[PDB]
């Protein structure tokens, strides 16, 4: 025990007096620093490099001074450590925090956030639960450890299992928060989620009464959202070393939890004050459906804004947080309620893919090829559930059952999809296809079936054909007629909305236009027609007019049509795989969006519609079209970079009954206008569609009928051969 | 430019005090942590340099004979914390706190700066800027 204060003059030794208070230390030692004993020494050196002497000081102190001291909430608690010493010391010693930058706002008075309205209150200790109420466990039932389906009926009904996995199998883990800004946190981990891309990374660690979501952008500042039990206090690391307890920025603690926001943007850098907005997320509800509903909502919203910026900074953070806290909710809900449901465990699998995609691609701007994600949850064993379902498929259906069989099939896949799942997905598409040619709309059940059928077939020279043929089918299904309805759907759904009491889900508003390749829907001709179809939905009409300005209604209709162009077609990775032929040469037009429409043909080939002068491919220029808005149908080849012009020969249609053999099928009936507007892409799928093609207006299918249309309407038939033909009649 | 692996060795403690300032000598440096679990069973001392343009703190080891550079503000904060607990009692301990009090009062201020953009990894690879 030695306290010794020295004064240095020139460098030989120093002039000092050493004062030991209560204990014996080697006194002659001071000629050499007190390394010998297990005790640590401290040396403060003040030297002005003018060669000026300054002064120094020393205290040798003992070793022990560095050593520290219904749902059960008292079993696995959240305990903050005092310092790095008994904890993970690596990131704290090695951080550039406080040296290069600071994770916290420089102004301490901006640290304390206000509590949001939607945040939990004494009367609502947890949050707001969504209306399709979580089914109560039947009184008699006993719950198995894990979740399993041994039968087909299991998916339709509710399947229950115990949340005990949370309390029994768990791991105590130390957590270093962002940039070592706060001392570590011991917690019992119920799960983790990782989402990565080119332009973004988000790490989500979740445990009993605990969540950490680390959110980072290549183009933006990182933030961490930490959730602790309200009774818990976190300690911020700061420059001034003598202040022992300071609270990292955040709002006041609530009934259930306390939330902390680490990272800058609180005082200034945020576009608005969303600080209190994002912090409120974990305290807004325990219903995972609630957060995901809000996620799907901002998803659609930002895809309309896709034009100006590849990256939406705010929306990225938001949808990230939402995704994260939903897993926090779900885990914490099960713990609190002692049980779980099968739908819940399956749903988060699909939600973790579909939302991450939109998060990284559209939100972060990253290349879709590099979008990946991983989840590890103790109450979830997806790979076991996969094998269970794999053996289920391996041993007539209504759209409802199909929607459920496909959803769970998409939710659990490692990339291995059961053959009969695909077979079901195909049949769903085609059945919707034959439906949509006679009728211009789809009910919410139909859309959900289409959605999952698509995601299954585009999931992964066999599977390649599925990608091409579905993109073909999606494109055909999307007509001028349907697009106006489909956009009205998205608009109506967003118009009448209840974040508080109801779920919003994208598959409920879906349509083939979201899965097609068409960039022409934002063209004035269509957007204008959309506006004129608004009063046909009087409720939606009144909502729009009583808030949005007449000018803004156009923007609205433009912005919703945008979704159909940007959802699939704008993704290059989807194109590059299923239509490499478009990209084969020095071709710019693909990425310059000069290709308005893309029509996959026999392998190695696809048609194209371009407004400009085509620099490649076999070119059919329709000459009846207005010159200022030209339509050039172009047949592209993978191995052929040559540029030529074809002749459109004309043929006539036989009598519908005349041939039981089908020489027509596989072609595409394209209906356009002399104004340069592309309307209907309809494929001839079956011998019956062919019969309806030969019809004069005795055809059920309207684009095949030159009556409901008008003089401007013209039509052309595209063979997969590359042969383009005019029909007589 | 010139980087720093975070540590040179030293066989004495008189070397560290007379050692130059990484702040002045180099441009960009990297703080480092010793390849040992428990610092206490190893670390023989802590040296603090106040008047450097970017004040620094050195963790010196006897047996290892290595001297590591660590975050000046974070380390001393974690120091004054662990020795400042309610249950801790000593007159020696008070001398530590007496010395640890006005450490950064003379030297240059801490950063008000915003960090740089880009992804962040977790604790495993300590706050690394990479996405995947």
């Amino acid at each position: 025990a030695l306290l010794r204060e020295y004064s240095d003059r020139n460098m030989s030794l120093k002039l000092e007096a050493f004062y030991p208070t209560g204990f014996d230390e080697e006194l002659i030692k001071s000629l050499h620093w007190g390394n010998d004993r297990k005790h640590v020494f401290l040396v403060i050196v003040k030297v002005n490099p003018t060669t000026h002497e300054g002064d120094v000081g020393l205290v040798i102190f003992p070793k022990y001074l560095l050593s520290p001291y219904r749902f059960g909430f008292l079993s696995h608690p959240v305990t903050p450590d005092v310092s790095f010493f008994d904890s993970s010391f690596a990131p704290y010693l090695t951080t550039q925090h406080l040296v290069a930058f600071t994770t916290f706002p420089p102004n301490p008075l901006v640290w304390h956030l206000e509590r949001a309205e939607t945040a939990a209150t004494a009367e609502r200790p947890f949050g707001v639960s969504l209306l399709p109420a979580r089914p109560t466990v039947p009184k008699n039932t006993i719950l198995e450890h894990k979740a399993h389906f041994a039968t087909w009926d299991a998916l339709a009904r509710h399947t229950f299992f115990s949340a005990e996995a949370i309390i029994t199998n768990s791991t105590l883990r130390i957590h270093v928060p962002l940039f070592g800004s706060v001392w570590p946190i011991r917690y019992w981990a119920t799960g983790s989620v990782l989402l990565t891309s080119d332009s973004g990374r988000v790490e989500v660690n979740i445990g009993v009464g605990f969540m950490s979501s680390l959110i980072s952008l290549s183009s933006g500042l990182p933030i961490e959202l930490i959730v602790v039990p309200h009774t818990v206090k976190l300690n911020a690391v700061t420059s001034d070393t003598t202040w022992f307890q300071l609270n990292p920025p955040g709002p006041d603690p609530g009934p259930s939890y306390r939330v902390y926001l680490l990272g800058r943007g609180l005082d200034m850098n945020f576009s608005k004050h969303a600080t209190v907005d994002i912090c409120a997320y974990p305290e807004e509800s325990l219903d995972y459906r609630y957060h995901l509903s809000m996620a799907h909502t901002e998803a659609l919203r930002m895809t309309t804004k896709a034009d100006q910026h590849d990256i939406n900074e705010e929306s990225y953070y938001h949808i990230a947080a939402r995704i994260a806290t939903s897993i926090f909710a779900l885990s914490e809900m099960g713990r609190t309620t002692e049980y779980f449901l099968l739908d819940e465990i399956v749903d988060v699998q699909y939600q973790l893919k579909f939302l991450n995609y939109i998060l990284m691609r559209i939100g972060a701007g990253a290349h879709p090829n590099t979008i990946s994600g991983t989840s590890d949850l103790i109450f979830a064993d997806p790979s076991q559930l996969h094998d269970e379902l794999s053996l289920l498929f391996g041993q007539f259906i209504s759209y409802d059952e199909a929607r459920d069989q496909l959803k769970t099939a998409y939710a659990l896949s490692r990339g291995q999809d059961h053959v009969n799942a695909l077979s079901l997905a195909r049949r769903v598409i085609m059945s919707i296809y034959k439906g949509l040619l006679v009728k211009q709309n789809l009910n919410a059940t139909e859309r959900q079936a289409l959605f999952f059928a698509s995601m299954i077939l585009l999931n992964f020279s066999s599977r390649v054909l599925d990608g091409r043929t579905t993109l073909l089918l999606m494109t055909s299904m999307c007509t001028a007629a349907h697009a106006t309805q489909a956009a009205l759907n998205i608009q109506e759904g967003l118009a009448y909305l209840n974040p508080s009491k109801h779920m919003f889900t994208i598959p409920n508003v879906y349509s083939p236009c979201m899965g097609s390749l068409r960039t022409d829907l934002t063209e004035e001709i269509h957007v204008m027609n959309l506006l004129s179809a608004i009063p046909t939905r009087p409720g939606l009409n009144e909502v729009l007019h009583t808030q949005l300005d007449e000018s803004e209604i156009f923007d609205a209709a433009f912005k919703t049509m945008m979704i159909f162009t940007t959802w699939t077609a704008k993704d290059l990775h989807i194109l590059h795989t299923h239509v490499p032929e478009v990209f084969t040469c020095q071709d710019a037009a693909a990425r310059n969006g000069e290709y308005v429409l893309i029509l996959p043909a026999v392998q190695g080939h696809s048609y194209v519609i371009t407004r400009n002068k085509p620099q490649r491919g076999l070119v059919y220029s329709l000459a009846d079209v207005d010159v200022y808005n030209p339509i050039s149908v172009v047949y592209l080849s993978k191995d052929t970079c040559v540029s030529e012009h074809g002749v459109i020969e004309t043929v006539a249609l036989p009598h519908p009954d005349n041939l039981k053999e089908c020489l027509y099928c596989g072609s595409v009936f394209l209906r356009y206008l002399t104004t340069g507007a592309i309307m209907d892409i309809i494929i001839i799928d079956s011998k019956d569609t062919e019969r309806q093609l030969a019809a004069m207006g005795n055809s059920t299918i309207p684009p095949f009928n030159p009556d409901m249309h008008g003089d401007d309407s013209k039509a052309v038939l595209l063979f997969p051969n590359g042969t383009v033909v005019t029909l007589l009649g | 430019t010139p980087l720093f692996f975070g540590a040179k060795p030293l066989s004495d403690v008189s070397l560290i005090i007379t050692e130059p300032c990484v702040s002045s000598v180099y441009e960009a440096w990297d703080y480092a942590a010793p390849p040992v679990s428990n610092l206490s069973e190893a670390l023989s001392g802590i040296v603090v340099k106040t008047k450097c343009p970017v004040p620094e703190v050195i963790l010196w080891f006897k047996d290892k004979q290595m001297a590591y550079w660590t975050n000046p503000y974070v380390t001393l904060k974690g120091l004054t914390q662990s020795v400042g607990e309610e249950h801790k009692s000593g007159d020696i301990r008070d001398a530590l706190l007496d010395a640890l009090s006005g450490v950064w009062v003379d030297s240059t201020p801490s950063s008000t700066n915003i960090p740089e953009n880009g992804c962040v990894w977790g604790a495993d690879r300590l706050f690394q800027r990479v996405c995947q």
Partner: antibody, heavy 120, light 108 residues
Framework: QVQLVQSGAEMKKPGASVKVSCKAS????????LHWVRQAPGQGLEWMGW???????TNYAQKFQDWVTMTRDTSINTAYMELRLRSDDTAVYYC??????????????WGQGTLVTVSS | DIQMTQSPSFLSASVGDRVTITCRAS??????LAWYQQKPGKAPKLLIY???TLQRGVPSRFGGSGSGTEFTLTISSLQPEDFATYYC?????????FGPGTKVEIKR
């Protein structure tokens, strides 16, 4: 040794304008805020406001808001306080260093004070 | 603007006693409060910077405790040198308010 020397002492008639100076030492001037607190005879303490010696920015109390101005000089490490005397302003004026960068309001070190008398 | 209350306003005690001064805030100050010692004719001196923490160099006889709206300063063993008036101060706000102070004399 951190020290602050104020200067020196003076008397000014009502309606005038007075300047008090604080001479820094022992610490980094740019790195810690400067606070002003005045004390009437036989009365308690009243916080007038603070100034960031680096930023130059000032924070004032409502009572002194239109009646006071605070300024510094980064070179000689001095801070200045200029007040318009309403004749109720007779007091001793102190300047003090904020000792905590992340917590506002902690006066770690004080000056020796300057008595200002207001009379005709 | 938070108003601060101190009780007692005045007290006198004897050497060796334990003096307890109290501080009251209009609303929750959480961790942030200070305690100052002003001798007659001299400048204020900081005692307790956080609610509970003793400034290095200040005698161990001085201590503090509190949270929220209520804080208490305690002199463990009173000495003749302790004659002063003691103030409490709000910390970490745009407006920093002082307690009215507590006069402490010494009985012989």
């Amino acid at each position: 040794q951190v020290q602050l020397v104020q200067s020196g002492a003076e008397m000014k008639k009502p309606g005038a304008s007075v300047k008090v100076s604080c001479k820094a030492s022992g610490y980094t001037f740019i790195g810690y805020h400067l606070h002003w607190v005045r004390q009437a005879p036989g009365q308690g303490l009243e916080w007038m406001g603070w100034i960031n010696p680096n930023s130059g920015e000032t924070n004032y109390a409502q009572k002194f808001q239109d009646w006071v101005t605070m300024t510094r000089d980064t070179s000689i490490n001095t801070a200045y306080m200029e007040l318009r005397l309403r004749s109720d302003d007779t007091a001793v004026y102190y300047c003090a260093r904020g000792g905590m960068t992340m917590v506002r309001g902690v006066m770690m070190d004080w000056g020796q004070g300057t008595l200002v008398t207001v009379s005709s | 603007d938070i108003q601060m209350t101190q009780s007692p306003s005045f007290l006198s005690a004897s050497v060796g006693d334990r003096v307890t001064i109290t501080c009251r805030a209009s609303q929750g100050l959480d961790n942030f409060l200070a305690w100052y010692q002003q001798k007659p004719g001299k400048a204020p001196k900081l005692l307790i910077y956080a609610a509970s923490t003793l400034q290095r160099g200040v005698p161990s006889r001085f201590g503090g405790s509190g949270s929220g709206t209520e804080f208490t300063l305690t002199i463990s063993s009173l000495q003749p040198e302790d004659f002063a008036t003691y103030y409490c101060q709000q910390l970490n706000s745009y407006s920093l308010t002082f307690g009215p102070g507590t006069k402490v004399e010494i009985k012989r």
